[PDB]
Amino acid sequence: SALGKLQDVVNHNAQALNTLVKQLSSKFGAISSVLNDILSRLDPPEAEVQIDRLITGRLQSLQTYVTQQLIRAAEIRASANLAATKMSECVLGQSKRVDFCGKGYHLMSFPQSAPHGVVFLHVTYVPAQEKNFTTAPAICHDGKAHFP
Amino acid sequence: DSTECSNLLLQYGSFCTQLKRALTGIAVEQDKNTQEVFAQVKQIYKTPPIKYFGGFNFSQILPDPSKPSKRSPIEDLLFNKVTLFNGLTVLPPLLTDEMIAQYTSALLAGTITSGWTFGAGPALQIPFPMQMAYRFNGIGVTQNVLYENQKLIANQFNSAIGKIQDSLSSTPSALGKLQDVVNHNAQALNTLVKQLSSKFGAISSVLNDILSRLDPPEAEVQIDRLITGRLQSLQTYVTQQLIRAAEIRASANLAATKMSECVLGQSKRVD
Amino acid sequence: FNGLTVLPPLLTDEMIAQYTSALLAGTITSGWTFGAGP
Amino acid sequence: TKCTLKSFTVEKGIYQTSNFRVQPTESIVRFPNITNLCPFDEVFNATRF
Amino acid sequence: AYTNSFTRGVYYPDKVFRSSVLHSTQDLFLPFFSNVTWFHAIHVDNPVLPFNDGVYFASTEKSNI
Amino acid sequence: LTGTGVLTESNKKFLPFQQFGRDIADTTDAVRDPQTLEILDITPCSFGGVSVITPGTNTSNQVAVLYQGVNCTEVNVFQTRAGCLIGAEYVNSSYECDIPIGAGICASYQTQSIIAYTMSLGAENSVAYSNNSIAIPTNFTISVTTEILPVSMTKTSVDCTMYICG
């Protein structure tokens, strides 16, 4: 599950559409869900009031769907802005911002395309094999202090 | 828990399922935000016992072994400064307050004893005055300037830390933001529960009377209104929560960035 | 379907891969410079 | 859990399947408390009609 | 005569207990600082007064007159 | 006044002409008996959500159940600040958490059983501070880390009227 995020995006969209199409079967209080039958077995005066319910219900469903899509689109755009920044700053140069382009001292980064996003290969430099030493802040020679 | 109402609610579809899904998404998001901000360090670094760092006085921020909660005094001041069914439940957070305080103490020990190193890999110990000399170079001032005014600099720092607590206590609305978060949530739930009393056009607000003083055929149309009205109210509530959650997430990302860049290192970004 | 479509994207995947290859070649042969000018 | 996820294979995790609610065990006679009636033993047990 | 009615005339409207809380209600009250007619119990005798919607009757006396 | 719930002896002073008690938002909290005039508290009987903890269809069919907003004293058994958990045994050992239950409690497959335990925030490293000592690295290692980011979503178009009424 390394690509959880991209997969998540796809699943969310698919699920939203699924529920939207599924909601056509609901009756919302009308005697039936299919329009043809209503227009077949009823006079126009009563079929009219039986059709209002279907209209209003389907309209609410659609309205919620579009709102959800707006929120998610804002979300993805925030993410995309972040990605563009990462491209510019980590790939086209070297960043001193700590722990932005990967954990460790950043050297460079390589981009790789993905179905709906990017995969950055941050190359970082990490120290190791430390050792103890004794230190002093300055050296005194000839009565005057020296600093490195 | 009215049988006839569930029987009628079956006609609207899977709305409640859908909203339930939305809310679970929000909850998991909250936990991830805390994770992202605080759980940056891998190892819980402990503070040495002889707490002498060349004149600097960190007593106000290090955890207090005296109090049982083990929060620094400033943290305690914060906890005291801010204060505060029908199928509604507020799940507890995953990280208890204690664990968050523990993470914070770890970050402090790391930064006091190792500088930025502990943020880039193996934590390397360094005497604290030399660490500050490094930082002085970081802003373009030669390090000898620090060694010649060590005492004075330490005094200024101690006094400033001391005035911080007084400022937080004397400031009347310093914690406006957190207090505001709490109040918004409380108010939202309050209006949601209070709106159950509205009739929305139905002849009465309690369903029992509705089903008592009326024949079933007419009780149907008297119950439709209550159903739709309460459903719409709940729907708006959920949308408001989505928007606020997006905003808070933006803020949390900003906080995480600030952690990484200002705490674990030194930033040249102005202001 | 019932009126619900899925318009296609403007940049095909192929062209995106080409852009990526361009960035790689640039960074491999020229370092920072290709982002600031020649 | 399978019924909620509509899937024969459920992955590792935690799922909110349903709700429970303790049922009422009794009914308590629905009453206020009375005190007095009206004149009936003075209309049917009347001495003279 | 005339006299403004100060903060008087409020009454419990719903016989429902509530503790340490603020509540807003729309009902027939005596507006504050409104003038109220004043009459004396010396002699003549008393005129009829209409009952528009509700009357607030106050009396200060010491003889059960 | 009709409702359901548990009745408890009250400690609040109803005024003598009062018949009801209300908290904020009209929740009827108390009532006085029409016979003995005693004050009674109303509490809605316990209710809550139930959750299932599962290690995966492909590992095993074992399962543990969590009653969230309740105490089992009125439902192996374990009580938590998040609710009472049944079917998993509490161990004193602390681990890196994978199935989050809440309030610092988690669960995982022991291996052959489902165990609940408190989270571990990592190992303790007490770096040796001293006023005159320095640790310097003598070797290095360059690593590569992968970061993924979503960029876009499916463009969707809908025909209103068709979707509405075919």
| Nearest residue on chain F to A83, alpha-carbon basis | F149
Contact D32 F100 (CB under 8 A): no
Of F123, F119, F61, nearest to F87 by C-alpha is: F61
The residue count for chain E: 65
Residues B70 and B101: beta-carbon distance below 8 Å? yes
Residues A126 and F142: beta-carbon distance below 8 Å? yes
Q: Tell me the chain F residues in contact with residue C8 when contact means C-beta distances shorter than 8 Å.
A: 155
Contact B147 A138 (CB under 8 A): yes
Is residue A120 packed enough to be buried (19+ CB in 10 Å), middle (13-18) or exposed (0-12)?
buried
Q: Tell me the chain B residues in contact with residue A23 when contact means C-beta distances shorter than 8 Å.
A: 13-14
How many Cα atoms within 13 Å fall on the side-chain side of residue B174?
12
Q: Number of CB pairs < 8 Å for A and C?
A: 28
Of A82, F49, F104, A4, nearest to B34 by C-alpha is: F104
Sheet arrangement for strand F83-86: D13-21, F47-54, F64-67, F83-86, F77-80
- In this complex, the residue of F47, F53, F56 whose CB is nearest that of residue D11 is F56
The DSSP secondary-structure symbol of B38 reads H
Question: Do the chains F and E touch each other, judged by at least 3 C-beta pairs below 8 angstroms?
Answer: yes
| Nearest residue on chain C to F162, alpha-carbon basis | C3
In whole angstroms, give the CA distance from residue A13 to residue A69.
9
How many Cα atoms within 13 Å fall on the side-chain side of residue A66?
10
Give how far A138 is from chain C: nearest CA, Å.
38
Q: CB-based contacts of D43: which residues, under 8 Å, 6+ apart?
A: none
In whole angstroms, give the CA distance from residue B217 to residue B14.
25
Structure tokens of F60?
């095993």
Measured torsion, CA atoms of residues A15, D1, D11, F150, in degrees rounded to the nearest 10: 20
Structure tokens of E24?
């807003």
Residue E64 to residues B259, C18, E41, Cα–Cα distance (Å): 81, 106, 11
In whole angstroms, give the CA distance from residue A38 to residue B99.
62
Give how far F19 is from chain E: nearest CA, Å.
6
Give chain E's end-to-end CA distance (angstroms, integer).
Answer: 21
Contact A127 B122 (CB under 8 A): yes
Measured N-to-C along each axis, helices B15-38 and B97-114 cross at an angle, to the nearest 10 degrees, of 30
- In this complex, the residue of C2, C6, C9 whose CB is nearest that of residue F156 is C6
With tokens 């009936």, the residue in question is: D40
- A144 φ, ψ (degrees, to nearest 5): -115, 150
In whole angstroms, give the CA distance from residue B31 to residue F100.
10
In whole angstroms, give the CA distance from residue D42 to residue D28.
34
Give chain F's end-to-end CA distance (angstroms, integer).
Answer: 50
In whole angstroms, give the CA distance from residue F103 to residue B94.
5
Q: CB-based contacts of B250: which residues, under 8 Å, 6+ apart?
A: A78
SS3 assignment, position E52: coil
The experimental resolution of this structure, in angstroms, equals 3.3
Of B255, B252, B259, nearest to B108 by C-alpha is: B259
Q: Tell me the chain D residues in contact with residue B24 when contact means C-beta distances shorter than 8 Å.
A: 16
Question: Do the chains D and F touch each other, judged by at least 3 C-beta pairs below 8 angstroms?
Answer: yes
Q: How crowded is residue B192: how many other Cβ atoms within 10 Å of its Cβ?
A: 19
In whole angstroms, give the CA distance from residue B233 to residue B213.
26
In whole angstroms, give the CA distance from residue F65 to residue F52.
5
Residue C1 to residues B37, B199, C4, F163, F166, Cα–Cα distance (Å): 44, 40, 6, 9, 11
Q: How crowded is residue F30: how many other Cβ atoms within 10 Å of its Cβ?
A: 21
Contact F142 A124 (CB under 8 A): yes
Is residue A20 packed enough to be buried (19+ CB in 10 Å), middle (13-18) or exposed (0-12)?
buried
In whole angstroms, give the CA distance from residue B136 to residue B41.
25
Contact B129 A137 (CB under 8 A): yes
Resolved by: cryo-EM
Which residues does residue B56 pair with via DSSP β-bridges, in sequence order? Answer: B53
Q: CB-based contacts of A86: which residues, under 8 Å, 6+ apart?
A: A100, A101, A109, A120, F147, F149
| Nearest residue on chain C to A110, alpha-carbon basis | C24
- In this complex, the residue of C4, C17, C23 whose CB is nearest that of residue A91 is C23
Q: Tell me the chain C residues in contact with residue F152 when contact means C-beta distances shorter than 8 Å.
A: 9
Is residue B140 packed enough to be buried (19+ CB in 10 Å), middle (13-18) or exposed (0-12)?
exposed
SS3 assignment, position E15: coil
How many Cα atoms within 13 Å fall on the side-chain side of residue A85?
10
b/e map of C1-38 (b: 16 or more CB within 10 Å)?
A: eeeeeeeeeeeeeeebeeeeeebeebbeeeeeeeeeee
Residues A11 and A3: beta-carbon distance below 8 Å? no
Give how far B129 is from chain F: nearest CA, Å.
9
- In this complex, the residue of F46, F50, F59 whose CB is nearest that of residue D17 is F50
Of B1, B8, B2, nearest to B228 by C-alpha is: B8
Measured N-to-C along each axis, helices B73-81 and B150-170 cross at an angle, to the nearest 10 degrees, of 20
In whole angstroms, give the CA distance from residue B42 to residue F121.
8
The two beta strands, F124-125 and F28-32, are: unpaired
Q: Tell me the chain A residues in contact with residue B224 when contact means C-beta distances shorter than 8 Å.
A: 29
Measured torsion, CA atoms of residues C9, C15, C20, C23, in degrees rounded to the nearest 10: -120
- In this complex, the residue of B11, B130, B143 whose CB is nearest that of residue A28 is B11
A11, A33, A71, A99: best mutation site toward chain B, by most B Cβ within 10 Å?
A: A99
- In this complex, the residue of F17, F19, F22 whose CB is nearest that of residue E18 is F22
Single-letter residue type at C12: T
Residues B148 and B136: beta-carbon distance below 8 Å? no
In whole angstroms, give the CA distance from residue B118 to residue F60.
41
With tokens 């009424």, the residue in question is: F165
Residues B42 and B257: beta-carbon distance below 8 Å? no
Residues B55 and B150: beta-carbon distance below 8 Å? yes
Give how far A113 is from chain C: nearest CA, Å.
6
Residues E38 and F51: beta-carbon distance below 8 Å? no
Chain F: partners with 3+ C-beta pairs within 8 Å: A, B, C, D, E
F154 lies within 8 A of chain C by CB: yes
Single-letter residue type at C31: G
Which residues does residue E36 pair with via DSSP β-bridges, in sequence order? Answer: E3
The alpha carbon of residue B85 and the mean position of all alpha carbons in its chain are separated, in whole angstroms, by 24
| Helix or strand holding residue A113 (H, E) | strand A105-113
Chain B: partners with 3+ C-beta pairs within 8 Å: A, D, F
b/e map of B98-112 (b: 16 or more CB within 10 Å)?
A: ebbbbbbbbbbbbbb
Residues F45 and E43: beta-carbon distance below 8 Å? no
| Nearest residue on chain D to F51, alpha-carbon basis | D16
| Helix or strand holding residue A123 (H, E) | strand A117-134
**Angle ∠(F9,F10,F14) on CA atoms, nearest 5:** 140
Which residues does residue F1 pair with via DSSP β-bridges, in sequence order? Answer: none
In three-state form (DSSP H/G/I as H, E/B as E, the rest C), the secondary structure along chain F is CCCCCEEEECCCCCCCCCCEEECHHHCEEEEECCCCCCEEEEECCCEEEEEEEECCCCCCCCCEEEECCCCHHHCCEEEECCEEEECCEECCCCECCCEEEECCEEEEECCCCEEEEEECCCCEECCCCCCCEEEEEEEEEEEEEEEEEECCCCCCCECHHHHHHC
The alpha carbon of residue A116 and the mean position of all alpha carbons in its chain are separated, in whole angstroms, by 10
Q: CB-based contacts of A8: which residues, under 8 Å, 6+ apart?
A: none
Residues C5 and A24: beta-carbon distance below 8 Å? no
Contact F129 B48 (CB under 8 A): yes
Chain D: partners with 3+ C-beta pairs within 8 Å: B, F
Contact B122 F137 (CB under 8 A): yes
Contact B24 D21 (CB under 8 A): no
Structure tokens of A77?
């755009």
Residues E2 and E35: beta-carbon distance below 8 Å? yes
Sheet arrangement for strand E16-17: E16-17, F20-22, F28-32, F39-43, F6-9
Question: Do the chains A and F touch each other, judged by at least 3 C-beta pairs below 8 angstroms?
Answer: yes
- In this complex, the residue of D15, D24, D33 whose CB is nearest that of residue F51 is D15
Structure tokens of A5?
């995020």
Structure tokens of F92?
């004193």
Q: Number of CB pairs < 8 Å for E and F?
A: 22
Q: Tell me the chain A residues in contact with residue C32 when contact means C-beta distances shorter than 8 Å.
A: 92-94
Residue A38 to residues A41, A53, A58, A59, B5, Cα–Cα distance (Å): 6, 12, 16, 18, 25
Q: How crowded is residue F155: how many other Cβ atoms within 10 Å of its Cβ?
A: 11
Single-letter residue type at F16: P
- In this complex, the residue of C3, C6, C9 whose CB is nearest that of residue F163 is C3
Is residue B129 packed enough to be buried (19+ CB in 10 Å), middle (13-18) or exposed (0-12)?
buried
| Nearest residue on chain F to C2, alpha-carbon basis | F163
**Sign for the pseudo-dihedral over CA of B190, B191, B192, B195:** positive
The two beta strands, F99-102 and F89-90, are: unpaired
Contact F146 A126 (CB under 8 A): no
| Helix or strand holding residue A118 (H, E) | strand A117-134
Contact F17 E15 (CB under 8 A): yes
